[PDB]
Amino acid sequence: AVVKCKPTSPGRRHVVKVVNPELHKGKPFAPLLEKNSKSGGRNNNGRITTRHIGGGHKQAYRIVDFKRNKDGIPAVVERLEYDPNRSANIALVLYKDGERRYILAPKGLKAGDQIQSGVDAAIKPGNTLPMRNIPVGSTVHNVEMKPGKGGQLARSAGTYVQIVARDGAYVTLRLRSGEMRKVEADCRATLGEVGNAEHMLRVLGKAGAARWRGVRPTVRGTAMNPVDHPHGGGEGRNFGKHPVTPWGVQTKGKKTRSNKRTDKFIVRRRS
Amino acid sequence: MSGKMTGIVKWFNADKGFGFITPDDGS
Amino acid sequence: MKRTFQPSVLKRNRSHGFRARMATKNGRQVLARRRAKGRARLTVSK
Amino acid sequence: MIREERLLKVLRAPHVSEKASTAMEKSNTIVLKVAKDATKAEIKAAVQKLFEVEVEVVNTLVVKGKVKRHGQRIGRRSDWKKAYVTLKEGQNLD
RNA sequence: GCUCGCCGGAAGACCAAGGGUUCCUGUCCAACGUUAAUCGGGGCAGGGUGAGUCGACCCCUAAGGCGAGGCCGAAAGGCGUAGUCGAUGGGAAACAGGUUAAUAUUCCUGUACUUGGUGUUACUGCGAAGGGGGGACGGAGAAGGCUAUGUUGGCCGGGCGACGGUUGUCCCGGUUUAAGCGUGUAGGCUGGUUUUCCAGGCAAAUCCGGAAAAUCAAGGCUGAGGCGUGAUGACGAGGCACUACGGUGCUGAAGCAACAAAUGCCCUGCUUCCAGGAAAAGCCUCUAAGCAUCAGGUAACAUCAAAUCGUACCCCAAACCGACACAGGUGGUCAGGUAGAGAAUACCAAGGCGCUUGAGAGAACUCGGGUGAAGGAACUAGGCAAAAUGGUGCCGUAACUUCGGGAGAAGGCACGCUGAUAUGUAGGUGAGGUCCCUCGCGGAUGGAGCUGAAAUCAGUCGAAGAUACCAGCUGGCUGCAACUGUUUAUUAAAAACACAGCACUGUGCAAACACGAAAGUGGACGUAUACGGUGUGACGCCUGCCCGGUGCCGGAAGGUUAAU
RNA sequence: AGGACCGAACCGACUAAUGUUGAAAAAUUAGCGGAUGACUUGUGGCUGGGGGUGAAAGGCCAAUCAAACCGGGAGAUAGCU
Ligand SMILES: [Mg+2]
Ligand SMILES: [Mg+2]
Ligand SMILES: [Mg+2]
Ligand SMILES: [Mg+2]
Ligand SMILES: [Mg+2]
Ligand SMILES: [Mg+2]
Ligand SMILES: [Mg+2]
Ligand SMILES: [Mg+2]
Ligand SMILES: [Mg+2]
Ligand SMILES: [Mg+2]
Ligand SMILES: [Mg+2]
Ligand SMILES: [Mg+2]
Ligand SMILES: [Mg+2]
Ligand SMILES: [Mg+2]
Ligand SMILES: [Mg+2]
Ligand SMILES: [Mg+2]
Ligand SMILES: [Mg+2]
Ligand SMILES: [Mg+2]
Ligand SMILES: [Mg+2]
Ligand SMILES: [Mg+2]
Ligand SMILES: [Mg+2]
Ligand SMILES: [Mg+2]
Ligand SMILES: [Mg+2]
Ligand SMILES: [Mg+2]
Ligand SMILES: [Mg+2]
Ligand SMILES: [Mg+2]
Ligand SMILES: [Mg+2]
Ligand SMILES: [Mg+2]
Ligand SMILES: [Mg+2]
Ligand SMILES: [Mg+2]
Ligand SMILES: [Mg+2]
Ligand SMILES: [Mg+2]
Ligand SMILES: [Mg+2]
Ligand SMILES: [Mg+2]
Ligand SMILES: [Mg+2]
Ligand SMILES: [Mg+2]
Ligand SMILES: [Mg+2]
Ligand SMILES: [Mg+2]
Ligand SMILES: [Mg+2]
Ligand SMILES: [Mg+2]
Ligand SMILES: [Mg+2]
Ligand SMILES: [Mg+2]
Ligand SMILES: [Mg+2]
Ligand SMILES: [Mg+2]
Ligand SMILES: [Mg+2]
Ligand SMILES: [Mg+2]
Ligand SMILES: [Mg+2]
Ligand SMILES: [Mg+2]
Ligand SMILES: [Mg+2]
Ligand SMILES: [Mg+2]
Ligand SMILES: [Mg+2]
Ligand SMILES: [Mg+2]
Ligand SMILES: [Mg+2]
Ligand SMILES: [Mg+2]
Ligand SMILES: [Mg+2]
Ligand SMILES: [Mg+2]
Ligand SMILES: [Mg+2]
Ligand SMILES: [Mg+2]
Ligand SMILES: [Mg+2]
Ligand SMILES: [Mg+2]
Ligand SMILES: [Mg+2]
Ligand SMILES: [Mg+2]
Ligand SMILES: [Mg+2]
Ligand SMILES: [Mg+2]
Ligand SMILES: [Mg+2]
């Protein structure tokens, strides 16, 4: 539920919360946690590789089953939890043999439902079965690219992938970007859309709400000196040049894909 | 002490002087 | 005002000490220069 | 068992002082200048053997050497070690 | 030595870092000390730092470093696995009193505690580099229960007043006591217990987790404080004696209660929110190979051991960083009284200082302040600076608005003391007493005593009652920027940057991109509701025409065109 | 509840005066802003010079920055003084 905040202060004037009351108001399941130390956008050389990253609230990592290998064994959904590491809510499930895991929560999933992976799985939202077992025209998520590697596609809050075709070993997918991609037909996929679809409906309201998320401020390039940026300089506001990166690469329109390895898997690019 | 003189010279010039004291560009 | 030397022996020895000099190649060349010049105190290290 | 040669090289000298005279007459404790590497057990064995007297406990401290100036040339005296040796009651020593 | 003045959330006390003998005693005054110096953080000599419990070391790990092999690289070398280092964090245990010229939770007295050993005695499943549990964790807020501590009363000892009065509703001082051990309270959490089974926890498992069934609602965990003991003790105002007048010795009264009360404790709690809040060991437990009555395990008792290093002194400073005995800078801990909302401010206590040149005189001028006739911004670039306002409670308060604000709008009234209501009220606290009880740190009742606002009425004093310190000037028009923030350390704090938001565009994951000759790493343990770049810069109404130029995208028939 | 309000600690540095061989190689006095947050602070760590970092002033990188410091090429060159 999106909740517009009352303007008792600037910084709450434009805030839209996304309140989900079904989430567990307690600590997460401890065995599935691990340390996630922050980086600052800095590599093993210590240099900043990707900018604007730093700070933010401390976050513990939740181990999430993307491979989804507990085949045949049904699992009931114990509770839904918040994951700070990602946009989608996660579900704590309990298998029959006593194993608990975290999965990505689908859209209509609630506490108490039964899910089941494997080939002999039914077709309801939550189940995971190979796309040679999945009917054409269905929306799936958490899609593997390679078999047994784990789901890599459609993991964000409201996403889904349509299955448009199948030719033997391959199925053709309609990705959320509009790209049509071939995937092997033995790769697992999970039924239904991912949960928190109204995640993009939030408004942070203020700058601190981005600093909570570790997003340091972005200096636009023309507000600099020419040694710093190509856009920099001018006596006033001057920009008489084509828009480039900080490293002198055209941004407005210039393509950067240079993978001739995966071009056979791309049916059509996005438009 | 010319060593305390070393201090004297080494850094009564490294004090660096502040600067001219008339905001005048004779421009 | 706050001046530029705020001492700490631990940081002094980790940064400029003997084993920090002997760790790397260039640090070993420093000790060879100071022995050749004939320094009494070869390093910081007491 | 500590060897007798080490026990003979542990003790250096008695330390005469007002605090030493007080501790000798009140707490029955002698104050010794000992070798620097000497431990408390080595001291207790040495006093129990070379003086033939019963040691209750040994307290130790390290004396830092002073920095002196002979003429105008700087110099530093040696660090030495000091032992408060508490004898049992009734025991006596010169 | 007597006065005076200053700090007193410090200009007092304890530490860390850092320094490194500056500590104490004797002696000296050449130099140092912004003067003299008999003095000194100065010179010279001597002395002084005592730990099983404090800290370090040590066991454990974080960020991160190193890194066998390894991968990569002209060489040097780079990264990094197993590992091994690395605190600022986790991990056993001691308190009170006395004492030195100088050390003390270290010595002494008293009373404790912890972990390892060996050794007997009983008992008998022991065992890990492995499994599980625990350690183990956020912000804010609300109270409640307490204590530290303070005040008053009581008690004891002393006093009866340099000047009117003061045997009393008078004055002064004291009224301290720990760790530990026992009790397990206010209060918080939790359903217990038994049996059977089980694709899980890399194998196993009696453990955890999960399925069943039965029985019992009542067991368990945690837990400040209190009480008792510790303690017939110690301390104790004072006295009694000697006195090197410094001291040392002996003796020693009362040692209670009520109220108020923390930012400290219960509280690593409870509630709530979103931005979703370290690890590992110690500890507990489970079994594996192994061992089979041996080894080992816990239980008691005894005994032994607990090493080594630091400990002096300054530590918001004359001892640290500033070249100085420099108006600078420096992290943590303690937090008395009166007034006060208060850690502000004023005066004081404990305690510590009077800032290492003074003496005069009382010109101009300068510095920092005080007051000012009449006028009241006429000054000036400009009301710069000054002056003024200033508190609590109540009344009342405009345009406009994003309906929150504006707004403390503006403006105004009251404010002291005494008495009465009421010899001190409402309220708070809560005793005795009585009753009940599955009986205790219990439950009712009860109201003593203590504490104690605020209001009204009457009176009264002064020029003035928020009397001192403290403590908003206000309003009107308008430009810019939405806002809070940031910035040129050392002439620029702004209209500049950032910002939430908007849009374009790239990117399908071995992502783009970026650092790297490379390996690799970040992005990201993320996957297009994501990430990067660019521009704009809340919100509201909007964002029009031009693709000729320059770019970019798409095209591939033709022309031209490289190495070969 | 709040990048909410007033306001000490704390952080900062808007104005004026002093001072300018200073008490001080940027401070004092009187006022000033924020003051539960994009806060601040201790300890330790990492990023290295055409490189870092930068809420971007060409700011900061040991009182030094339109390319640090030290040593070396090196007695650079100097139609200039
Ligand atoms: Mg960015
Ligand atoms: Mg932006
Ligand atoms: Mg920007
Ligand atoms: Mg600029
Ligand atoms: Mg350029
Ligand atoms: Mg222009
Ligand atoms: Mg133009
Ligand atoms: Mg002892
Ligand atoms: Mg010691
Ligand atoms: Mg005097
Ligand atoms: Mg005073
Ligand atoms: Mg000396
Ligand atoms: Mg002295
Ligand atoms: Mg002396
Ligand atoms: Mg003289
Ligand atoms: Mg003199
Ligand atoms: Mg001296
Ligand atoms: Mg340890
Ligand atoms: Mg590591
Ligand atoms: Mg390495
Ligand atoms: Mg190697
Ligand atoms: Mg280690
Ligand atoms: Mg530590
Ligand atoms: Mg002392
Ligand atoms: Mg474990
Ligand atoms: Mg927390
Ligand atoms: Mg009390
Ligand atoms: Mg009188
Ligand atoms: Mg009289
Ligand atoms: Mg009294
Ligand atoms: Mg007790
Ligand atoms: Mg001390
Ligand atoms: Mg002090
Ligand atoms: Mg002085
Ligand atoms: Mg000073
Ligand atoms: Mg006070
Ligand atoms: Mg004050
Ligand atoms: Mg005068
Ligand atoms: Mg005046
Ligand atoms: Mg006048
Ligand atoms: Mg007048
Ligand atoms: Mg005029
Ligand atoms: Mg005028
Ligand atoms: Mg003014
Ligand atoms: Mg004024
Ligand atoms: Mg105008
Ligand atoms: Mg602004
Ligand atoms: Mg600043
Ligand atoms: Mg800054
Ligand atoms: Mg400036
Ligand atoms: Mg300024
Ligand atoms: Mg990668
Ligand atoms: Mg702009
Ligand atoms: Mg346009
Ligand atoms: Mg065009
Ligand atoms: Mg083209
Ligand atoms: Mg605020
Ligand atoms: Mg000021
Ligand atoms: Mg404020
Ligand atoms: Mg410029
Ligand atoms: Mg500088
Ligand atoms: Mg350079
Ligand atoms: Mg250059
Ligand atoms: Mg040459
Ligand atoms: Mg030359």
Residue spans per domain, chain C: 1-46
Nearest to residue A72, comparing CAs of A128, A114, A117, A113?
Answer: A117
Strand E-proximal residues of A, range 56-75, CB below 7 A, are: 56-61, 63-64, 72-74
Query: A93 to each of A61, A88, A99, A100, A102, how far by Cα in Å?
Result: 17, 16, 8, 6, 6
Residue B19 Ramachandran class (φ > 0 left, ψ -120 to 50 alpha, else beta): left
A181: tokens are: 């991609």
DSSP label at residue A264: G
Resolution of the experimental structure, in angstroms: 3.0
Q: How far is the CA of A118 from the centre of ligand 10 (A)?
A: 97
Mark whether A199 and A157 lie in a shared domain.
no
Q: Give the ligand at the shortest distance from the Cα of A222.
A: 4
Domain with A158, as residue range(s), is 117-194
Q: A59-78: b or e for each residue (b if 16 or more CB lie within 10 Å)? A: eeebebbbebebeeebbebb
Which of A70, A93, A113 lies at the terminal end of a domain, its last residue? A113
Q: Is A92 helix (H, G, I), strand (E, B) or coil?
A: strand
Nucleotides of F under 7 A from a protein CB: 1-4, 20-21, 24-27, 37-39, 43-48, 52-58, 62-63, 66-67
Q: How far is the CA of D84 from the centre of ligand 57 (A)?
A: 63
Beta-bridge partner residues of A92: A79, A102
| CA–CA separation, A158 and A134 (whole Å) | 20
**Bridge pairing between strands A33-34 and D29-34:** unpaired
CATH of domain C1-46: 1.10.287.3980
| A262 CB inside 7 Å of strand E | yes
Query: D89 to each of A197, C2, D26, D55, D56, how far by Cα in Å?
Result: 87, 60, 11, 10, 9
Nucleotide nearest to A19 (CA to C1'): E274
How was this model experimentally determined?
A: cryo-EM
Nucleotides of E under 7 A from a protein CB: 17-21, 43-45, 47-52, 62-66, 76-77, 79-80, 87, 100-102, 106-108, 132-134, 136-137, 198-201, 208-211, 273-279, 305-311, 320-323, 328-330, 402-404, 482-484, 489-490, 496-501, 504-516, 520-523, 525-539, 550-554
Mark whether A188 and A202 lie in a shared domain.
no
Q: Give the ligand at the shortest distance from the Cα of D81.
A: 9
User: H helices of chain A, where?
Assistant: 208-211
Chain C: list its partners (3+ Cβ pairs within 8 Å): none
Mark whether A105 and A2 lie in a shared domain.
yes
Query: A232 to each of A68, A129, A195, A248, D52, how far by Cα in Å?
Result: 50, 54, 43, 12, 91
Nucleotide nearest to C1 (CA to C1'): E329
Place of tokens 């199948």: A166
Mark whether A1 and A80 lie in a shared domain.
yes
Which of A174, A194, A214 lies at the terminal end of a domain, its last residue? A194
Cβ neighbours for A40, distance < 8 A, ≥ 6 positions apart: A48, A53, A54
Place of tokens 């100036």: D69
Mark whether A233 and A151 lie in a shared domain.
no
Q: Which amino acid is at A194?
A: V
Number of domains in chain A: 3
DSSP-assigned letters across all residues of B1-27: -TTHHHHHHHHHSTT------S-----
| Residue D43, Cβ density class (10 Å: 0-12 exposed, 13-18 middle, ≥19 buried) | buried
For residue A244, what is the domain's CATH number? Answer: 4.10.950.10
Which of A162, A194, A226 lies at the terminal end of a domain, its last residue? A194
Nearest to residue A79, comparing CAs of A98, A92, A94?
Answer: A92
Residue closest to sugar C1' of E43 by CA: D69
Q: How far is the CA of A216 from the centre of ligand 5 (A)?
A: 25
* 3-class SS letters over A20-59: CCCECCCCCCHHHEECCCCCCCECCCCCECCCCECCCCCC
